[PDB]
Design a protein around this ligand. Structure first.
Ligand code: U1H
Ligand code: U1H
Length: 330
């Protein structure tokens, strides 16, 4: 079997992408943030503290004839940006773009951090990292992808994120019409539970390509591109007037500047991020300082190929017994 769903940016800056997901019987449709950097499927629900819900669509397990409470199970997760949530666990039927999994663990939020409350357009997250990172206790639960794997035509899913435009998540097949050229595959390490790979280097604008190994994770759940300080300094040095701002928390640049492209290596292949993708607009309404889409990973501890990088490519997440990542231009 296969599945295919359209994913849509939540705002004019592509800060995140939401994808409709059907939960329960009869179907309750929620718009979830597909996150290859985490492994929990959790949703706003009728159990969430009412003061922490502000416009989100909620999952109501009592109205689903297939929902079963998972006795004694709880979950608690904290994300790298400081966000967090926690609650209890149900099992229910979950469908994505025609692809159905029965008995999927649906983690019902009782408490969410403020960053989720203020994001009215995200009803929850659907984790697509490896199941070893799932936070359900005392019995760890499998991801949607892991549960669907056996029934998929091919044990893959692909991410085709749009620049200021809708895109597609496909499960079980590779749309050979969605990319140009060849797909370059590269090795994945699962030792930390992430889709972790090693980029072969980078170039700034039309500059010389620098061969150097950058270990990082492919994370659809992170907006920006987080790279080592040496790389990020070399990029912003080519932008007149750009500087690192402690009060803002990263590199800013005059909004009138034109940004150079950024190239990262995948084996012998090259993925080019257009300069316009790195512009994230004024730091505050009316400001002539703009926020940069490439930032230092020094404070994070790991390099993150977030949406800024992934949306420049067609990305294959190959969940075979030896997992690999595939990148193609589009
Ligand atoms: N998108 C989920 C996520 C959040 C944080 C991290 C970090 F910062 F710990 F690497 C990885 C993945
Ligand atoms: N990386 C996972 C993640 C995704 C979205 C959010 C936000 F923006 F909704 F708070 C936080 C953390």
């Amino acid at each position: 079997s296969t599945g295919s769903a359209t994913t849509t940016p939540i705002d004019s800056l592509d800060d995140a992408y939401i994808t409709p997901v059907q939960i329960g019987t009869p179907a309750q449709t929620l718009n979830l943030d597909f996150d290859t950097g985490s492994s929990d499927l959790w949703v706003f629900s009728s159990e969430t503290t009412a003061s922490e819900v502000d416009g989100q669509t909620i999952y109501t397990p009592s109205k689903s004839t297939t929902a079963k409470l998972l006795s004694g199970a709880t979950w608690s997760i904290s994300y790298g940006d400081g966000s967090s949530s926690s609650g209890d666990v149900y099992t229910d039927t979950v469908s994505v773009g025609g692809l159905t999994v029965t008995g999927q663990a649906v983690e019902s939020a009782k408490k969410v951090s403020s960053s989720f409350t203020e994001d009215s357009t995200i009803d929850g997250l659907l984790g697509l990292a490896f199941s070893t990172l799932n936070t359900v206790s005392p019995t760890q639960q499998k991801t949607f992808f892991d549960n669907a794997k056996a029934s998929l035509d091919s044990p893959v899913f692909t991410a085709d994120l749009g620049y200021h435009a809708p895109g597609t998540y496909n499960f079980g097949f590779i749309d050979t019409t969605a990319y140009t050229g060849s797909i370059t595959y590269t090795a994945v390490s699962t030792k930390q539970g992430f889709w972790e790979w090693t980029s072969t280097g980078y170039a700034v604008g039309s500059g010389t390509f620098k061969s150097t190994s950058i270990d990082g994770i492919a994370d659809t759940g992170t907006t920006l591109l987080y790279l080592p300080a040496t790389v990020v300094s070399a990029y912003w040095a080519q932008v007149s007037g750009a500087k690192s701002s402690s009060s803002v928390g990263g590199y800013v640049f005059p909004c009138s500047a034109t940004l150079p492209s950024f190239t990262f290596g995948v084996g012998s292949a090259r993925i080019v991020i257009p300069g316009d993708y790195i512009d994230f607009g004024p730091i505050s309404t009316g400001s002539s300082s703009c926020f940069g889409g490439i930032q230092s990973s020094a404070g994070i501890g790991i390099n993150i190929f977030g949406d800024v990088a992934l949306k420049a490519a067609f990305v294959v997440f190959n969940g075979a017994t030896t997992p690999t990542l595939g990148f193609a231009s589009k």
